[PDB]
């Protein structure tokens, strides 16, 4: 069947003491393994859309069903557990903790799940060597360059077998030399274990490698108009 189902997502926002309509009638469907891409302008509400799919907000006018379960009849603990089990987040602001090392930063999702203590010493550096950064595992984000620690953030979400991965401008700071290098393993993850990931950017040049094109303008994604 289908993995995700969101329909009639009328998300409002507070702009001038009135709930302005920033999203309306969002009826996009997400399958298992197949890769899609959403393209929109920075300000059209594309960034806010990803927060609603992860259960981090409330649309107050619609419902999102993930794996046959809506988010309405769940508490905060259940939503956080679902996020730690069958979700994964990638951002463009380089969201890392500048207190932990590279090895510890990616082991946090496994630490919250309370897995085997030696399991985090076998799977984290495995991801670091898969992306090719295990040599700088015992380092600090204040030491790594801008384009170096970004791959650490990319691999942080891909540890606890993520079924669905949200991305928001993964290639925002790192150059085009490693832009294909960070995409080849992401594509191989689809044929290795059968994972699904969606990416939201504003450019159509890097969307060629994606298997779908669902660009959205002001909460509407209907056709290939541009």
């Amino acid at each position: 069947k289908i993995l995700l189902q969101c329909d009639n997502l009328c998300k409002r926002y507070q702009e001038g003491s009135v709930q302005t309509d920033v999203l309306h009638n969002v009826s996009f469907s997400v399958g298992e393994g197949e890769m899609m891409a959403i393209v929109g302008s920075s300000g059209s509400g594309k960034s806010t859309l990803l927060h609603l799919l992860g259960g981090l907000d409330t649309p107050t006018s619609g419902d999102v069903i993930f794996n046959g379960q809506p988010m309405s009849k769940l508490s905060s603990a259940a939503k956080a557990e679902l996020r730690n089990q069958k979700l994964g987040f990638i951002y463009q602001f380089h969201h890392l903790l500048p207190d932990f090392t590279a090895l510890e930063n990616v082991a946090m999702p496994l630490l919250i799940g309370k897995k085997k203590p030696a399991e985090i010493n076998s799977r984290a550096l495995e991801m670091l060597k898969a992306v090719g950064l295990d040599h700088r595992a015992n380092h600090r984000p204040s030491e790594l360059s801008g384009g170096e620690r970004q791959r650490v953030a990319i691999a942080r979400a891909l540890v606890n077998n993520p079924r669905l991965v949200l991305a928001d401008e993964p290639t925002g700071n790192l150059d085009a030399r490693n832009a294909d290098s960070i995409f080849q393993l992401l594509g191989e993850l689809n044929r290795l274990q059968g994972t699904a990931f969606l990416v939201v950017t504003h450019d159509l040049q890097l969307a060629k490698r994606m298997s779908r094109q669902l660009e959205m303008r002001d909460g509407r994604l209907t056709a290939e108009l541009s």
Binding site: G54, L56, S76, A77, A80, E81, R83, N84, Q85, F89, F93, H95, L96, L97, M108, P109, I112, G113
Partner: peptide, 15 residues
């Protein structure tokens, strides 16, 4: 705030 948000996204409950 960014660290709190990232922890919330990774599966850390507000409690």
């Amino acid at each position: 705030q960014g660290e709190v948000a990232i922890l919330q996204t990774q599966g850390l409950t507000p409690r």
